[PDB]
Write a protein that binds this ligand. Structure first.
Ligand SMILES: [Zn+2]
Length: 271
DNA sequence: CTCTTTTTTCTCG
DNA sequence: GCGAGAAACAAAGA
């Protein structure tokens, strides 16, 4: 999922597993643990979960005083808290067993990843990933944002998806943000004027914070953490091909931009 | 049966 | 370094 969905899962996990001692850890797909499954199992078994943080679309389990399990859900990763006797589901890959339940990770496409690193390696880890600022008024500086946009010829949608200008936007929210800011996805960033960049900046923050408040977008659902989201009922363009724009009434169109499905209003978002 | 569609990171030119 | 295309992988629809 995107930042809102990951934050939703983070909040649920924080509320339910913090303080839990990991009894055992099993894997049917050990290869998704990029730092080595057996090594992770040896290091984390018997340890207690102290907290759950997030950076961009990355989940950060704080286990023991020196361990950090970095988890990325990628396209389809899903977590669920189940009973110890819960039957296995086809795409379940890993499980963290507690005394009165277990945290199961499932991922149909097997894109999701787990990486075990030390507490002091977290900041360097994200610096290496070149992740941009969190989408908040406090961390997302419009001035630097503007300067980077002015220096580039990249198209705005692909550039925003890079996670370098700001962290957290995925295909759904980048489409929603550009529609809200009335900017065409193929617009070269150096062509954006100051007022448009200002609207874009605030729209990125507003859309994501709203999505977080509503528990993310669940255009699917299911017995999993963060599956009761209501943001999907607020989407203005994503997956609305053929429907009418809520502002002007023109039909929402869908095109391909840098290989990604792209939804936009041809009237509100002039090319 | 073929082709298309649905986050991150690499190859190629 | 950059843009285009694709891979990792599974499933469902045209
Ligand atoms: Zn419109």
């Amino acid at each position: 999922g995107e930042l809102p969905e990951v934050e939703t899962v983070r909040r649920e996990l924080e509320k339910r597993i913090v303080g839990q001692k990991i009894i055992s850890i099993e894997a049917t797909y050990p290869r998704m643990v990029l730092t080595g499954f057996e090594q992770l199992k040896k290091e984390l078994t018997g340890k207690t979960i102290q907290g759950i943080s997030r950076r961009g679309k990355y989940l950060i389990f704080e286990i023991g005083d020196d361990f950090r399990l970095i988890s990325h859900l990628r396209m389809e990763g899903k977590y669920r808290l189940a009973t110890l006797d819960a039957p296995r589901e086809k795409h379940d890959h890993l499980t963290m067993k507690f005394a009165d339940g277990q945290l199961i990770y499932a991922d149909v496409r097997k894109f999701g990843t787990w990486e075990l690193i030390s507490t002091d390696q977290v900041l360097p880890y994200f610096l290496k990933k070149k992740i941009g600022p969190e989408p908040t008024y406090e961390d997302f500086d419009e001035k630097l944002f503007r300067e980077k946009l002015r220096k580039s010829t990249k198209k705005i949608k692909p550039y925003l998806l890079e996670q370098t200008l700001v962290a957290g936007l995925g295909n759904i929210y980048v489409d929603e943000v550009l529609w809200l800011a009335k900017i065409h996805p193929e617009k070269e960033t150096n062509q954006l004027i100051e007022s448009s960049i200002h609207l874009l900046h605030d729209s990125i923050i507003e859309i994501l914070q709203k999505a977080i408040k509503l528990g993310g977008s669940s255009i699917r659902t299911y017995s999993a953490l963060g599956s009761t989201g209501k943001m999907q009922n607020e989407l203005q363009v994503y997956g609305k091909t053929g429907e009418k724009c809520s502002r002007c009434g023109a039909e929402i169109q869908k095109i391909k931009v840098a290989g990604r499905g792209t939804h936009f209003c041809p009237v509100c978002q002039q090319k």
